């Protein structure tokens, strides 16, 4: 009777994070959902969320459905699976867990079907999503097959910019791209001690262009590095647009739009 929705809506976004396509919500936010066996089966679980949701008690297993042939249709029925489903909820009925995480455990054993006993996730990605020291980078964008990306960093006098950019350019992870371009700029807020130098390592046409680019963009005292990578066809629909919004915040934040 306090933040029951927040935790509820959070488990939704959490199960989403773990398994998107696998879960299907009948209702907009929580209330009623249909999850399908994590093995990507065909037996879908119809579950509702009563006024006494996880916090109060637990969700409500309303029904189960399954796409089956005449091979194992005699072994289990929908109402039958519903019975064991319920006895499993009994587990996720008095735990600090909401349901989804703990109940899959029992289902994992009772439903059987065990392929292997190991885990292999996907952690291979060129596109940077992790933070950097001194550096604030978060703008990877997508193009046909290619990937675009930029790293911004607020800086002080020339030593700072020189070192952090030196290092970054000679860094083997940034070294992995097709062509990288960089631009640094230092302008005294209200003084004359300014240090500026050009670049052209990757593509030379981008060197002076990027320089005047940061000039016309109304921005100083901050550095930016752009890199081009090759990936899949479009890498992912959620890659460019969604990160664009996030990236937009970073670039602006690091002092690109003050």
UniProtKB/Swiss-Prot annotation:
Q: Which residues form the RWD domain?
A: 10-114
Which CDD domains does the entry mention?
RWD_ScYIH1-like
Q: Which GO terms describe its biological process?
A: cellular response to amino acid starvation; GCN2-mediated signaling; negative regulation of kinase activity; negative regulation of protein phosphorylation; negative regulation of protein-containing complex assembly; regulation of translational initiation
Top-rank taxon of the source lineage equals Eukaryota
Glycyl lysine isopeptide (Lys-Gly) (interchain with G-Cter in ubiquitin) cross-link, chain position(s): 187
Keywords (alphabetical) are: Actin-binding, Cytoplasm, Isopeptide bond, Nucleus, Repressor, Stress response, Translation regulation, Ubl conjugation
InterPro entries xrefs: Impact (IPR023582), Impact_N (IPR001498), Impact_N_sf (IPR036956), Ribosomal_Su5_D2-typ_SF (IPR020568), RWD_dom (IPR006575), UBQ-conjugating_enzyme/RWD (IPR016135), UPF0029_Impact_CS (IPR020569)
Q: Quick one: where is this thing mainly located?
A: cytoplasm
Care to name a GO molecular-function term for this sequence?
protein kinase inhibitor activity
Pfam families in the cross-refs: RWD (PF05773), UPF0029 (PF01205)
Where in the cell is the protein located? Cytoplasm; Nucleus
A cellular-component GO term for this protein? nucleus
| Family (UniProt) | Belongs to the IMPACT family.
Question: What other comment is given for this protein?
Answer: Present with 3030 molecules/cell in log phase SD medium.
Q: What does this protein do?
A: Translational regulator that ensures constant high levels of translation under amino acid starvation. Plays a role as a negative regulator of the GCN2 kinase activity; impairs GCN1-mediated GCN2 activation, and hence GCN2-mediated eIF-2-alpha phosphorylation in amino acid-starved cells and subsequent down-regulation of protein synthesis. In normal conditions, it resides in a actin complex and has no activity.
Quaternary structure annotation from Swiss-Prot or TrEMBL: Interacts (via N-terminus) with GCN1 (via C-terminus); this interaction reduces the GCN1-GCN20 complex formation and prevents the interaction of GCN1 with GCN2 protein kinase and GCN2 activation in amino acid-starved cells. Interacts (via C-terminus) with ACT1; this interaction occurs in a GCN1-independent manner. Interacts with RPL39; this interaction occurs in a GCN1-independent manner. Associates (via middle region) with ribosomes; this association occurs in a GCN1-independent manner and persists under amino acid starvation conditions.
Q: What is this protein called?
A: Protein IMPACT homolog
């Amino acid at each position: 009777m306090d933040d029951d929705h927040e935790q509820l809506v959070e488990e939704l976004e959490a199960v989403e994070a773990i398994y998107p396509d696998l879960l299907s919500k009948k209702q907009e936010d929580g209330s009623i959902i249909v999850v399908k066996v994590p093995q990507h089966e065909y037996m879908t679980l119809q579950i509702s969320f009563p006024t006494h949701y996880p916090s109060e008690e637990a969700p409500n297993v309303i029904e189960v459905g399954v796409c089956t042939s005449l091979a194992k249709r005699d072994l289990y029925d929908t109402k039958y699976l519903q019975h064991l489903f319920q006895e499993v909820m009994d587990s996720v009925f008095h735990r600090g867990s909401v349901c989804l995480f703990d109940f899959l455990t029992e289902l994992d054993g009772v439903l059987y079907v065990e392929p292997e006993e190991e885990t292999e996730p996907v952690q291979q990605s060129d596109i940077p999503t992790d933070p950097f020291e001194g550096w604030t980078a978060s703008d990877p964008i997508t193009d046909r097959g290619s990937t675009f990306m930029a790293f911004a960093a607020h800086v002080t006098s020339e030593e700072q910019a020189f070192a952090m950019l030196d290092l970054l350019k000679t860094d083997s992870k940034m070294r992995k791209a097709n062509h990288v371009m960089s631009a640094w700029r230092i302008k005294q807020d209200g003084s004359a001690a300014t240090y500026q130098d050009s670049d052209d390592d990757g593509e030379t046409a981008a060197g002076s262009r990027m320089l005047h680019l940061i000039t016309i963009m109304d921005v100083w005292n901050v550095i930016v590095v752009v890199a081009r990578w090759f990936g899949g066809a479009h890498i992912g629909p959620d890659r460019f647009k969604h990160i664009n919004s996030t990236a937009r915040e970073a670039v602006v934040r690091a002092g690109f739009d003050s």
